[PDB]
């Protein structure tokens, strides 16, 4: 049920179009992850600290394919954002985890994102969220591209804007 587009076609416009497809809520995010790691990824699970998603992770992501995912704040006057982690098991047996954080209150928080490869199979949970958010140098949603050596012969290059209607674009390629 998850859309896997051609890797080379992933763009900011694709993600903005994904945002429009979701309801008109104050906080939501469109995520695009381009797999050019040379290895196939199999969806593990997702962990949402805040907010939810009306879809599921694309089960299988071959090399050359970009998964499209999305999330949103729960509807209602309550002050909640869209905060979560998605995890993918790679063919080498390691875990590629991605954190996205789209807060409600911009006086108290900023958009943050992070990506990391853990050794072995590790499901996304609150422990991984806390680690990726506070301890593992997340990147701020600042409209900038940032490169992060992931280890294991792979690198990441991603972008995330600074507004509630956020888009997060990540490319995982060989180092």
Curated annotation (Swiss-Prot):
Keyword Transmembrane carried by entry: yes
Documented effect of changing residue 41 to F: Expressed only 7% of the wild-type hemolytic activity
Superkingdom assignment: Eukaryota
Biological processes per GO annotation: cytolysis in another organism; monoatomic cation transport; pore complex assembly
Site (Interacts with the lipid membrane) residue list: 140, 156
Positions of phosphocholine binding: 50, 83, 101, 103, 129, 133-134
GO CC aspect terms: extracellular region; nematocyst; other organism cell membrane; pore complex
MF annotations from Gene Ontology: channel activity; toxin activity
Site annotation Important in the initial contact with the lipid membrane: residues: 108-109
The entry's keywords: Cleavage on pair of basic residues, Cytolysis, Ion transport, Membrane, Nematocyst, Secreted, Signal, Target cell membrane, Target membrane, Toxin, Transmembrane, Transport
Annotated stretches, region: Trp-rich region, which is important for the binding to lipid membrane: 101-116
UniProt keyword Cell inner membrane present: no
Motif Cell attachment site, crucial for protein stability location, chain numbering: 140-142
Ranges that cross the membrane: none
Primary location group: secreted
Subcellular location, record wording: Secreted; Nematocyst; Target cell membrane
Positions of the UniProt region annotated as N-terminal region: 7-26
Region (Plays an important role in the hemolytic activity): 1-8
Domain notes: Composed of a long N-terminal alpha-helix and a core region rich in beta-sheet structures. Before the pore formation, the alpha-helix binds the lipid membrane, partitions into the lipid-water interface and stabilizes the monomeric molecule on the membrane. Finally, it traverses the bilayer, thus forming the transmembrane pore.
Functional description taken from the UniProt entry: Pore-forming protein that forms cations-selective hydrophilic pores of around 1 nm and causes cardiac stimulation and cytolysis. Pore formation is a multi-step process that involves specific recognition of membrane sphingomyelin (but neither cholesterol nor phosphatidylcholine) using aromatic rich region and adjacent phosphocholine (POC) binding site, firm binding to the membrane (mainly driven by hydrophobic interactions) accompanied by the transfer of the N-terminal region to the lipid-water interface and finally pore formation after oligomerization of monomers.
Quaternary structure and partners: Octamer or nonamer in membranes. Monomer in the soluble state.
Family label: Belongs to the actinoporin family. Sea anemone subfamily.
The protein's name in its UniProt record: DELTA-actitoxin-Aeq1a
Shown residues in whole-protein numbering: 40 to 214 of 214
